[PDB]
A paper describes a structure:
Here, we report evidence that MBLAC1 is a nuclease specific for cleavage of RD histone pre-mRNA. Crystallographic and biochemical studies show that MBLAC1 has an overall MBL fold and di-zinc ion containing active site related to that of CPSF73, but which has distinctive structural features involving active site flanking loops and the absence of the β-CASP domain, which is only present in CPSF73. The combined biochemical, cellular, and genetic analyses presented here provide clear evidence that MBLAC1 is an endoribonuclease selective for 3' end processing of RD histone pre-mRNA during S-phase of the cell cycle. Studies with recombinant MBLAC1 purified from human or E. coli cells, define MBLAC1 as an endoribonuclease, with selectivity for cleavage at the biologically authentic CA dinucleotides (positions 27 and 29 using our nomenclature).
To investigate its function, we solved a crystal structure of MBLAC1 (1.8 Å resolution, space group P1). The structure reveals a stereotypical αββα MBL- fold with two central mixed β-sheets (I and II), comprised of 8 and 5 strands respectively, surrounded by helices. MBLAC1 has four of the five characteristic MBL-metal-binding motifs, His116, His118 Asp120 and His121 (motif II), His196 (motif III), Asp221 (motif IV) and His263 (motif V) (using BBL numbering) with two waters completing metal coordination. In the structure of recombinant MBLAC1 produced in E. coli, the active site was refined with two iron ions present. However, MBLAC1 produced in HEK293 cells preferentially binds zinc ions. Four MBLAC1 molecules (chains A-D) are present in the crystallographic asymmetric unit; analysis of interactions at the crystallographically observed monomer interfaces identified interactions between chains A-B and C-D possibly reflecting dimeric MBLAC1 in solution. The metal containing active site is adjacent to the dimer interface, rationalizing reduced dimerization as manifested by metal ligand substitution or metal removal. However, although there is low overall sequence similarity (27%), the overall MBLAC1 fold is structurally similar to the human endoribonuclease β-lactamase-like-protein 2 (LACTB2), RMSD 2.23 Å over 153 Cα atoms, an endoribonuclease responsible for mitochondrial mRNA maturation. Comparison of the MBLAC1 and LACTB2 active sites reveals very similar di-metal ion binding modes and proximate active site residues. Two other regions in the MBLAC1 structure (aa 51–66 and the C-terminal region, aa 239–266) are disordered, implying flexibility and possible involvement in substrate recognition.
Numbering used by the authors:
A (entry chain D): 5 to 54, 70 to 242
B (entry chain C): 5 to 53, 70 to 241
Write the structure that this text describes.
Amino acid sequence: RTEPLCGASPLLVPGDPYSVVVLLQGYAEPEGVGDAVRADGSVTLVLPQTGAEAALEEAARGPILVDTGGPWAREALLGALAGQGVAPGDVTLVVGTHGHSDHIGNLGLFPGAALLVSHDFCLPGGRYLPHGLGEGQPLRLGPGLEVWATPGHGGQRDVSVVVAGTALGTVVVAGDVFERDGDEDSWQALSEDPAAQERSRKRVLVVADVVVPGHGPPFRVLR
Amino acid sequence: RTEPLCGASPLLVPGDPYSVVVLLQGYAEPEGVGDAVRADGSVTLVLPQGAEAALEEAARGPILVDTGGPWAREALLGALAGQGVAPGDVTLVVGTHGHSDHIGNLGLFPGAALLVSHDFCLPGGRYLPHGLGEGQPLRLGPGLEVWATPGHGGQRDVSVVVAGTALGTVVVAGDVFERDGDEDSWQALSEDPAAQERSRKRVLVVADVVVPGHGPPFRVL
Ligand SMILES: [Fe+3]
Ligand SMILES: [Fe+3]
Ligand SMILES: [Fe+3]
Ligand SMILES: [Fe+3]
């Protein structure tokens, strides 16, 4: 069973060593007539408490942003960050779950951050460092903090961020692996590779107590 | 065969009704030791002299094809200004695929329509559906088309084809071509080598000039 996670906005999930704050909740709204959709992706902040393998671990010692929204969301992102006491210049790592325009629209706000966009990792300045991310080999960012390969939606190189040890248990920031709570009958049409995405969805639901989907509010996973 | 395209920088290909200017030439440089690579994507400006209608309207002003990584912001702004273009003047941004060194500065152009891979949205994030496919290009204008060129980034990569320039047909190919002479290097970087080879052949049939993702433009002879 799953229930949308209600509570004070922005949704803050305290934890140790990492807290998670959903800065902007995603949406995807159809229109009264025609087939257009107004949408934007969720943006999540992972906050540490108060070759490529080592660089990732170092870049994760500061604020980590998971997705950035579309370009139109720039002022709202800046405001949300400020609300958490974080200047754009303070962000040390940006993770882009996949390369769609409503998820990676504001990378340029963070020229001082390391960037992990899908499976490509670079230091600030565009020095790309190879690594071995795969479905059987997650990337360790820190204690109880990992990047998973969760292919399917955007293609074979989508990633998710898994945050263990919060007050609500394990939070998975899943990109569009999940569209929203109750997307059981809608996600397949949006998917590049439904078979892969199904494997990824099942994998996430084994570990997650909370899922932050790409286009809706976070939800709890019950057992 | 192919040959590097020589001339004055920035590389300007005049034409009618569209001119093409390579604002920033991409590169991907290995290091003296270890396996790291410093890279950035080519950025091209196409200048005029439901979704189908929106696309034609958005292509009536300056069109940017890719944007470079986030570290390239000031260089991109400078190059645009050198062409008399303010960022606010750009009416359409085309992202060939979603890698960080191609779509790193989308946020500079909030007033532009965006076509990143197969997703088209008006400014503000209103996404409009369309029928782009390998057998169904999107028409932007006279002799200006977006092609579906899958392979490198995945199944939804796109390329911009500009007919009628002084040098003939210019294809802005994203990473469909890494660089002139990439014959034995592109495969390792490809998410679907079968699709990418299909796309490379398609492009080479029509192109007189290719702007690849990580090198200078080259002529096709
Ligand atoms: Fe999305
Ligand atoms: Fe998506
Ligand atoms: Fe590239
Ligand atoms: Fe690429």
